[PDB]
Amino acid sequence: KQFLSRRGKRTSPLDLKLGHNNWLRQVLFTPATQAARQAACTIVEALAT
Amino acid sequence: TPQTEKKLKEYSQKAVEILRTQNHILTNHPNSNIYNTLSGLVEFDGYY
Amino acid sequence: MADQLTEEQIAEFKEAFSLFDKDGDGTITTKELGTVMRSLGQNPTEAELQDMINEVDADGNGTIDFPEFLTMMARKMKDTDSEEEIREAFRVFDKDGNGYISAAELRHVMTNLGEKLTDEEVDEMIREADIDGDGQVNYEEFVQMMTAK
């Protein structure tokens, strides 16, 4: 499948490798409100199964 | 005091820079929304 | 067989093994065997893990020591796959042993994998895996396919 994507027309899936700067750090430590931080915590906890 | 043009530009730059920094401080303050909403409804002295 | 590995790699493997050692006997359990080399920067799959514990833990104890850990490790950083492995994959693909991987055998092997595709897609990949124009994958085609970079 990798070779087919390399030469043919099938889409190439992305690699599980995360950036160290993102919106996640912005949301997780926001001092405007606490519910945003809690919702971000729930989202990232659910992302790790 | 009569003064040269370069000093005048420096002075104006300092004033405008201080004003801009304080405006940025005000518009991103964590409690800015609460104070801005409370201003037009209740009468209060200080920011508690 | 492990002489091809530079000394610092053995040292860091020892560091990882000792840190992953629980009871201080220099021997660990196979449940965390995935995490040991999973922590070194390489990423295996569950089938990879089950096969690795199968190859070594023949007695079924579920416990790994250092020399056989080095045995497992020495066969991981190799880039050019051993021709025995490629030939064995060819044999698995060639269920009937005729040396030609037809579309139907591909369908069987993909369905057993749990994955689904249409007839058109598998025909398309077969015809892009063919160089002689006969629409049939042979050993030389497979070898030149896996050596392409």
UniProtKB/Swiss-Prot annotation, chain A:
Domain commentary: The UBR-type zinc finger forms a pocket that mediates recognition of type 1 N-degrons. In addition to substrate-binding, the UBR-type zinc finger probably positions substrate proteins in the proximity of the bound and activated E2-ubiquitin conjugate to enable their ubiquitination. Constitutes an atypical E3 ubiquitin-protein ligase composed of a hemiRING-type zinc finger, a UBR-type zinc-finger interacting subdomain (UZI) and an N-terminal region that can serve as an affinity factor for the E2 conjugating enzymes UBE2A and UBE2B. Compared to classical RING-type, the hemiRING-type only binds a single zinc ion: a hydrogen bonding network is present instead of a second zinc ion.
Cystine connections: none
Family note: Belongs to the UBR4 family.
Subcellular location: Cytoplasm; Cytoplasm, Cytoskeleton; Nucleus
Protein name: E3 ubiquitin-protein ligase UBR4
Protein function: E3 ubiquitin-protein ligase involved in different protein quality control pathways in the cytoplasm. Component of the N-end rule pathway: ubiquitinates proteins bearing specific N-terminal residues that are destabilizing according to the N-end rule, leading to their degradation. Recognizes both type-1 and type-2 N-degrons, containing positively charged amino acids (Arg, Lys and His) and bulky and hydrophobic amino acids, respectively. Does not ubiquitinate proteins that are acetylated at the N-terminus.
Associated clinical condition: Episodic ataxia 8: A form of episodic ataxia, a neurologic disorder characterized by episodes of poor coordination and balance. EA8 affected individuals have attacks of unsteadiness, general weakness, and slurred speech. Additional variable features include twitching around the eyes, nystagmus, myokymia, and persistent intention tremor. Inheritance is autosomal dominant.
Subunit structure: Component of the SIFI complex, composed of KCMF1, UBR4 and calmodulin (CALM1, CALM2 or CALM3). Interacts with E2 conjugating enzymes UBE2A and UBE2B. Interacts with RB1.
Organism of derivation: Homo sapiens (Human)
From Swiss-Prot, chain C:
N6-methyllysine, modified sites: K116
Molecular functions per Gene Ontology: adenylate cyclase activator activity; calcium channel inhibitor activity; calcium channel regulator activity; calcium ion binding; calcium-dependent protein binding; protein kinase binding; protein phosphatase activator activity; protein serine/threonine kinase activator activity
Activity regulation remarks: (Microbial infection) Inactivated by S.flexneri OspC1 and OspC3 proteins, which specifically bind the apo-form of calmodulin, thereby preventing calcium-binding and activity.
Annotated consequence of substituting F142L: In LQT14; reduction in calcium affinity; not changed protein abundance; not changed structure; significantly decreased thermal stability in presence of calcium; no effect on RYR2 interaction; significantly reduced ryanodine-sensitive calcium-release channel activity; impaired negative regulation of high voltage-gated calcium channel activity; impaired regulation of cardiac muscle cell action potential and
Outcome of substituting E141V: In LQT14; loss-of-function variant causing impaired negative regulation of high voltage-gated calcium channel activity; impaired regulation of cardiac muscle cell action potential; decreased calcium ion binding
Additional free-text comment from the UniProt record: This protein has four functional calcium-binding sites.
Descriptive protein name: Calmodulin-1
Native organism: Homo sapiens (Human)
